[PDB]
Amino acid sequence: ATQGQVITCKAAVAYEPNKPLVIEDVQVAPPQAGEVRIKILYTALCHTDAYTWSGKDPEGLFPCILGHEAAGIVESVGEGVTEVQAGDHVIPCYQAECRECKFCKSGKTNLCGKVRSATGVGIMMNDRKSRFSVNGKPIYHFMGTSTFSQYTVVHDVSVAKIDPTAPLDKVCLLGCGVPTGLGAVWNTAKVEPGSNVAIFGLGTVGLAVAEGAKTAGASRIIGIDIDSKKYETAKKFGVNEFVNPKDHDKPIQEVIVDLTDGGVDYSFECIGNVSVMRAALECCHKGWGTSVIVGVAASGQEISTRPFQLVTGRVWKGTAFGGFKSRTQVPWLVEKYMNKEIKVDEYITHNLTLGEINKAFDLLHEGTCLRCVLDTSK
Amino acid sequence: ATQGQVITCKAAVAYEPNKPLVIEDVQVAPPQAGEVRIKILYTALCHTDAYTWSGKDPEGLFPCILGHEAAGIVESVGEGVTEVQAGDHVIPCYQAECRECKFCKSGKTNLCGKVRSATGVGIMMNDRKSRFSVNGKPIYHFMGTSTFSQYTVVHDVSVAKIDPTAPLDKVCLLGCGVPTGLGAVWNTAKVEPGSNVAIFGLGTVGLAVAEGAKTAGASRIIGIDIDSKKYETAKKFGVNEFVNPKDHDKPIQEVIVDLTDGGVDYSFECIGNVSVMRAALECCHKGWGTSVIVGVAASGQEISTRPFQLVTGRVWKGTAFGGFKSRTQVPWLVEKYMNKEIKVDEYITHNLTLGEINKAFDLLHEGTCLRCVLDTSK
Ligand SMILES: NC(=O)c1ccc[n+]([C@@H]2O[C@H](COP(=O)([O-])OP(=O)(O)OC[C@H]3O[C@@H](n4cnc5c(N)ncnc54)[C@H](O)[C@@H]3O)[C@@H](O)[C@H]2O)c1
Ligand SMILES: NC(=O)c1ccc[n+]([C@@H]2O[C@H](COP(=O)([O-])OP(=O)(O)OC[C@H]3O[C@@H](n4cnc5c(N)ncnc54)[C@H](O)[C@@H]3O)[C@@H](O)[C@H]2O)c1
Ligand SMILES: [Zn+2]
Ligand SMILES: [Zn+2]
Ligand SMILES: [Zn+2]
Ligand SMILES: [Zn+2]
């Protein structure tokens, strides 16, 4: 039995920014009250991992085990945990759903405050310490998930129980970019049939917005990206018009307004660039257009516009995980995937192993790369 | 009888920015196709008039007859005019409602449309000339209204027909500030019973927000003003807590978040100050708070925030004329007033004559002045 015992396993440890990750045998402590220990079978990576690895995350603490997009099988649960048990298939989520805080009970938001005071500084709530160690020294958790590892320990309030027949090498993507994009359309914007939409940035997030908009019945789905090779890829996801800002001297907002005789019904910024966020708002139609910020700006960066943009009827909003409540709705997303109503496989452009994680990180710089999934068994 | 004749009457003319208005006899030409000539009995003044008069307006065309808040009686109508006739009591409105343009037909906005190509450059649609002259030299219209005169000519699409028993020296306020503040609450924000609200600026607009919020069922109605004398006044309008930012070292948004354990459900900026607009966004509650810009900022000034504010669930909006459709809904607001369901009288702190209009502009500096109503007979 591994039950109640320390597990020794392989993990990719980031000891310093910009140094290659080291595959180590780490000690993974057993789960304390309200905790779940998960055997991670597959983990994806994205630029959020890379940002922290690169030393730019104000919350980054080293050494740490990165990774926040994964799916595995519960090994063991700690005292009091009732919603999952050993053997359940699960997606650990970086956004919790406690069901008991003011945010959860509001019915007006998917934010949840419950464990953020621990997860944001790389530790567990129960004892304000890590469950990972190498040579008896602690290793920080990351985003409450730490999925670059054969085993992790997470808060129960962050574990989504999923269909046990769903392929774990695909549904790992339902912990980040795909829900955020779909949900930006379906939950945050509530895009109606016939709407015209602009999507700025055609990475995994922007491609999931395109899928969500297409599914919701949008008409024009105009993609905007500085890399023109993104368009052929994006077509399959629903983008049906394309503009590269580099092909126009006029501000991209002015180009989209011209193209649409006044602007779009909804826009989505899927990059993290405050200038492009402004452009996204300014290309929305007067009277009713709504812009949704999905990208995450760097610390200290600000969005600006002239207030007449809002006085004359444009609405500025943003989204966190697409407005989805993680424990309740990630499983539903998995169901939709199993019934072929959402795409997941099409976002997975590469498959490597945890051992090749440094090689995976090198792929993030390639324009053709959407998500890369890692098999943690080797 | 005066129908078909040029009328000679008193008007206050602005010959250039920043000089006292000249009370002159002027010639008011008869109405042409789709026009209405109105005997104005009472007109108020506001910031919008002063913005142009002071030379701050970029549209600023001189010489002109300023004024946009008024009530009167129709003296005659032009060819094709069917919805009003001689003897009707009316409020001319700077916001048109044609019912026939893409915006009027949309059902998603109040922002017509139909006569701006003329009103925006001080003339009439039918012949692209002005109806006003002095000594044979044209005087431009303003805002499609020009109500600082005993008679004016306005496009039919801008004329609200109202209860002929309503007092014209009170309902002259129902073409600008009072509707904007009420509707910002009822139409733009859709404030729910039990909401907590912050209102930045307790002039006529902010007090109208207070009354809208109180009527909608709001709980905490927190007023913020740099003039603490404004509070005692605001209480009757519904304001039930007050903060003067000068009494705090911390930025006002931080004070308001501390006072409300996280922020308000809705905020309203009722000043026109881009820094305050930002504060009003940043004092909204995480996950759901919405801020509505009601204030009109100087041309060129930008609003800014960090986009994490919107990603974590605050929504930034703004309003034009409180979302009310002028011709349809101004008569409804008059009905509400006559049935004692909305305040109007209480916003009128001073009464002067058109002869005294320069003293009225002086009162716009007066902390004690909300609206000043001018009797055009002298
Ligand atoms: N709000 C949330 O809850 C949430 C969750 C996940 C990811 N995100 C954010 O979404 C963003 C997108 O992530 P991703 O994994 O899709 O990123 P990505 O790197 O795969 O894609 C970004 C795309 O933007 C394009 N781009 C860059 N600069 C551009 C510009 N100036 N104009 C137009 N296109 C431009 C790139 O060519 C690329 O196609 C990131 O900021 C990420 O942090 C947000
Ligand atoms: N959106 C629209 O359709 C529309 C229509 C009418 C008026 N407006 C605008 O609404 C705004 C207010 O008009 P009003 O007639 O009520 O103005 P007002 O001058 O009577 O009132 C402004 C109030 O704000 C206060 N104030 C000034 N600076 C402040 C600060 N830094 N912090 C807190 N309080 C401050 C003043 O003390 C005053 O009490 C104006 O900008 C006007 O242009 C908008
Ligand atoms: Zn991710
Ligand atoms: Zn919670
Ligand atoms: Zn006004
Ligand atoms: Zn119209």
Swiss-Prot record, chains A, B:
It catalyses: a primary alcohol + NAD(+) = an aldehyde + NADH + H(+); a secondary alcohol + NAD(+) = a ketone + NADH + H(+); S-(hydroxymethyl)glutathione + NADP(+) = S-formylglutathione + NADPH + H(+); S-(hydroxymethyl)glutathione + NAD(+) = S-formylglutathione + NADH + H(+). This is Alcohol dehydrogenase class-3. Its EC number is 1.1.1.1, 1.1.1.-, 1.1.1.284. Binds 2 Zn(2+) ions per subunit. Induction: Down-regulated by wounding and activated by salicylic acid (SA). GO terms for molecular function: alcohol dehydrogenase (NAD+) activity; S-(hydroxymethyl)glutathione dehydrogenase (NAD+) activity; S-(hydroxymethyl)glutathione dehydrogenase (NADP+) activity; S-nitrosoglutathione reductase (NADH) activity; zinc ion binding. It is found in: Cytoplasm. One of its GO terms (cellular component) is cytoplasm. Zn(2+) 2 binds at C98, C101, C104, C112. An alcohol binds at T48, H68. The modification N-acetylalanine is found at A1. Keywords: Acetylation, Cytoplasm, Metal-binding, NAD, Oxidoreductase, Zinc. Its cofactor is Zn(2+).
